[PDB]
Amino acid sequence: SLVELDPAPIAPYRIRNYTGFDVIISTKTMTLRLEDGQEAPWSFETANSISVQLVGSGFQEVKSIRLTREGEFLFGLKPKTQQVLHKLLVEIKLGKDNIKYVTLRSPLLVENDTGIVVELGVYDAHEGHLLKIERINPGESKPAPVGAAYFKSLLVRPDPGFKYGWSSDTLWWRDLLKRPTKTLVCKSEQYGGEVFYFRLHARWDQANPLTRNYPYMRLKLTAPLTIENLLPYDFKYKIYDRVNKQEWNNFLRKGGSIPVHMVDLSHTFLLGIEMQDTPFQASEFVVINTGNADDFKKDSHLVVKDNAGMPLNLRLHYFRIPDGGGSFKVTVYSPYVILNKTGLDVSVRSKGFMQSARAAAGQTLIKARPLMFSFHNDDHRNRALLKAGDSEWSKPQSFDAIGSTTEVVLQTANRNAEIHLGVTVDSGQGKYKMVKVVTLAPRYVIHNKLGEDINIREPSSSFWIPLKHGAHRPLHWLQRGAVKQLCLCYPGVDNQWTAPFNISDLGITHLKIALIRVEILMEDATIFLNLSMEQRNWPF
Amino acid sequence: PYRIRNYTGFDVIISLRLEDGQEAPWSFNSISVQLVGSGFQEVKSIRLTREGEFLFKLLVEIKLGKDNIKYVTLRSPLLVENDTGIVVELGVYDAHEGHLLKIERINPGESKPAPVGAAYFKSLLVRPDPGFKYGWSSDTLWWRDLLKRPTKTLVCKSEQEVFYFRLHARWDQANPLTRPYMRLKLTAPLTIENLLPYDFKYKIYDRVNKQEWNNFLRKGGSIPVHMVDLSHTFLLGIEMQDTPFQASEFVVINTGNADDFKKDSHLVVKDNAGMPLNLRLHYFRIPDGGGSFKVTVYSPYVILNKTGLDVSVRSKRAAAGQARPLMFSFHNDDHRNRALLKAGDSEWSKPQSFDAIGSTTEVVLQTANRNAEIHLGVTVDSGQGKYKMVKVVTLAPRYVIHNKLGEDINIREPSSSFWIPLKHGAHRPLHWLQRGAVKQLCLCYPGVDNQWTAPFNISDLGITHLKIARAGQRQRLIRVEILMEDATIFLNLSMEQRNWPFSMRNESDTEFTFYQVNPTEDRSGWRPVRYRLPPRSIMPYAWDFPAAKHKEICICAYNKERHVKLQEIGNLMPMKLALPNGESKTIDINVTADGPTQTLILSNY
């Protein structure tokens, strides 16, 4: 056999060298030589401190670097030339893997918060020469070389394959102390009009005085615009710059987000969408960013008209990227999404407070597409009306109550049956938190697990309907009464119907047929009836 | 399968000799009835297969009862129904000689006929039970007078106090035997029903026959009144015991013939502070009663405070008479009227509907000067059975936790340093919660140097397993059952007395180590917990962090790692390990499904 055990449970450092020089790290016995850009694990087999010497830098070996606390600790490189005090920054981050990541670098950091590879170049602006160039992956950061961050300037460009040149201005920390926020312009090598845009924000602690004497900054590079699609459909979008009059076309799936590097935030630019697979036309342009010269208020809504002409008022959410220096995300969403899960084709109308009732835009027939829904204005007194099949229109229902289940009883046309629906209104899960999801369901659903086919009938009614084994079916039309009931029979002729059982009484109920267990359980405004053969002892 | 009731006023012979007033069974399909000493011939060819009223004047009533037996009452076509609650004596009166012939008792609910032959010539009189000491009816009950005036008040003076019946006579207008085929129903003139959640003492006043009448009525109770006449305008006044309400003013429950007072559809009670409550009065006319009716005092809303907090309700003024159930009304009857709730030290709520029949809503209350919220569940239903006109509004906690672990436990929201104790066998509402879309909880054994568990989502309905351990002790599995009753998510914490969902079975000659993969934003609380699986061993495992979306494990051997899932059946994808002696080993990985348990088998290839 095997040894049965109880389920009880059971290189702590990783050092990277981003200094621009080869380093030698020795404990205060064990040595590790690291090239520039390489990382290696580290363990201590004085206390828990190391000593770092930058090879070929002309700097003394920094002693007594304790690696136990986390944060950014600055050490003074000892041969000061002319009151220059160059600093080595040791950054320690305790990651989620319970491993302290240790970065040896200069205090100037460049953060790539874009989705593409960015090349950072070390530039001598007096000589016109690019000393070195390092690549930064998306979501990563790289520093200027140690020592060179004080004297040399910086340039950024995208990945060469994109054929965009270096930034037309430099990234100089003494200029960034007075002007930390800057749009970085990169001209194209294939089109004079084509111009890639970065947006740079520089940030530091305003209490540390060393940033007035040394580049102790972080330089975050972002996309100036990000477009998120939280509709339940895809769209093709069209960005128009009012200045110099360019238009850029692209595609965006449901749930997706895309960065744009083709617009500058000093220009007024506009968004237009054309939703795919939906009875709506292309939208008009809405102002998603104003310029420094223009004074347009940016649009909070986006109108799409269907093929009949009725409007749908989508909403635009703006989120400023933190530490981004004015770069933002725009999100197109529908304020309501109605899910028709009744099985019957459902018409939805919108009625205002003092306004009249109008039909909803883009209503199709069922297999049921999700229906984007908005009111004509943003009143809390606005309500909606529902119609299921050949039923009468509903009472005014509220789609604003977050986390609510409501029974809706519809009287029906030319008969005395009634349709019973369950309406759930929730907020969308995760990133769809600003979208109110309205599920329309039948209130009663019966499911057959008896092993064979069955016939069901409400006992105040001569109208019977079958139900196959393993098939679920809703119970739409019901006869009027306070308590709702049902009866079962086998499909053989001259078999007898059962006693009536209340289909709204939650719990288990036994029922003899010529023992059947009916369990009755509510789930998201829908009472589910489950029929089964009782495989236990009878209660009497 | 037959039962014959001889109510003819004579003795009959059925071909069974049945005397007058005696019932007897019968089987066999027709019979013949001889009325002995009546001066009539033998009625024969009496079919007993169909139900109804058949005339031969002689009447045979056949009723197919609940015990599917053929009830066969032989009678005259003049029947007196006792639909009152007391025993009624019926007398056969000869008004030309002042002469009472026979006296027949009628129990409540049943009916008794006039004698055959004497119905067409002699009049009738009713009275109550002679233990009540009330005389006969002052007027006579003559059916020719009832053919023109079918509805009357029957008055009975006391023998040392006036008793009243309401008589209505009904018949088929298309019957050819008009001018005595009729039914004479006797009802109480008034019935008062209490559908309040408190008892009251009531008092009936009247303008004519100035006579106050005081009595008591419990909750859910109904009482007939025989001391008033429907020709009199009379008034009802209630006073509820064990309430903070005072006595009510008199409202008009019956108008007279000569008066023009409107019948009050409402009844206002006032509390000890002066705030009003508008109870409603439902009137139900008794069918074929001749205008006798039932009045019903009910509250339009009953608010049940099941939260455990002190709750105030306002109506858009404050509610009157503010756990006992709270009767609630609005100032008027508009569907745009809403209410506001306050619970404890929280702000007032959004406008809530008490008219939304069959609804469960979640109400979130921002508390005063702190960033915690109170989460409530509001359920609005109609009452059960006879309470269907009352709207019942239950205020409940949104979340309730229940300890069935056997030991005491401590609970904590994972974004909070504030922990709450929880004794064994104790229900507790989770009122105050931190803000956020995903509400979570953590458990810990009491005492320091004990670690908290992984967070689990308390809004995800179903079964969730959670691993817990004391300091230096082994792990035990907690079953967390999360179920929604009605605006109340009950969390039940028990110790799992079932095999664990996973069994790591290392059949190979290689020591492994396994851990749950980092999902990364996340709210699983993932920390590194590695387990050692020595060669030829087995150990049950439950997810270390059940709040993760994608859940896989990572097995590790000789600085090699392999992610494997734990729900699929696997694909026997082997893992190649480079051993320090220079050779290579190959570990086959399979997942079998033993019922609810998924077993991971690592073998040698």
Numbering used by the authors:
A (entry chain A): 3 to 12, 20 to 37, 53 to 69, 84 to 404, 413 to 560, 568 to 593
B (entry chain B): 21 to 35, 56 to 68, 86 to 113, 125 to 228, 232 to 250, 253 to 389, 396 to 401, 414 to 611, ...
Tell me what the authors wrote about this structure, in their words:
VPS13 family proteins are thought to mediate directional bulk glycerolipid transfer between organelles at contact sites, where organelles are closely apposed, effecting membrane expansion and organelle biogenesis. In yeast, Vps13p localizes to multiple contact sites in part via the so-called VPS13 adaptor binding domain (VAB), near the C-terminal end. The VAB, with no significant sequence similarity to any previously characterized protein domain, interacts with a Proline-X-Proline (Pro-X-Pro) motif present in receptor proteins at contact sites. Receptor proteins include the sorting nexin Ypt35p on the endosome, Spo71p on the prospore membrane, and a multipass integral membrane protein, Mcp1p, in the outer mitochondrial membrane.
Here we present the crystal structure, at 3.0-Å resolution, of the VAB from the fungus Chaetomium thermophilum, complexed to the Pro-X-Pro motif of Mcp1p from the same organism. Although we were unsuccessful in crystallizing the VAB domain by itself, we did obtain crystals of a construct comprising the VAB of C. thermophilum Vps13p (residues 1,944–2,635) N-terminally fused to the Pro-X-Pro-motif of Mcp1 (residues 15–32), PXP(Mcp1ct)-VABct. The VAB comprises six modules of the same topology arranged end to end to resemble a fishhook. There are two VAB molecules in each asymmetric unit. In the second copy, PXP-VAB1–5, we modeled only the first five repeated modules (residues 1,944–2,516), as the electron density for the sixth repeat was poor, most likely because this repeat is flexibly positioned with respect to the rest of the protein. There is strong density for the Pro-X-Pro-motif fused to the N-terminus of PXP-VAB1–5 (L17V18E19L20D21P22A23P24I25A26E27), showing that it interacts in trans with PXP-VAB1–6, binding on the acidic face of the VAB at the conserved interface between its fifth and sixth repeats. Residues L17-D21 form a short β-strand alongside and parallel to the fourth β-strand of the sixth repeat module, with the two conserved hydrophobic residues (L17 and L20) packed against hydrophobic surfaces. The two proline side chains (P22 and P24) are buried in a groove that runs along the interface. A prominent patch on the surface of the sixth module and extending to the interface between the fifth and sixth modules is highly conserved across fungi, indicating functional importance. Further, mutation of an asparagine residue at the C-terminal end of the first β-strand of the sixth repeat module of the VAB (N2521 in C. thermophilum Vps13p) abolished Pro-X-Pro binding.
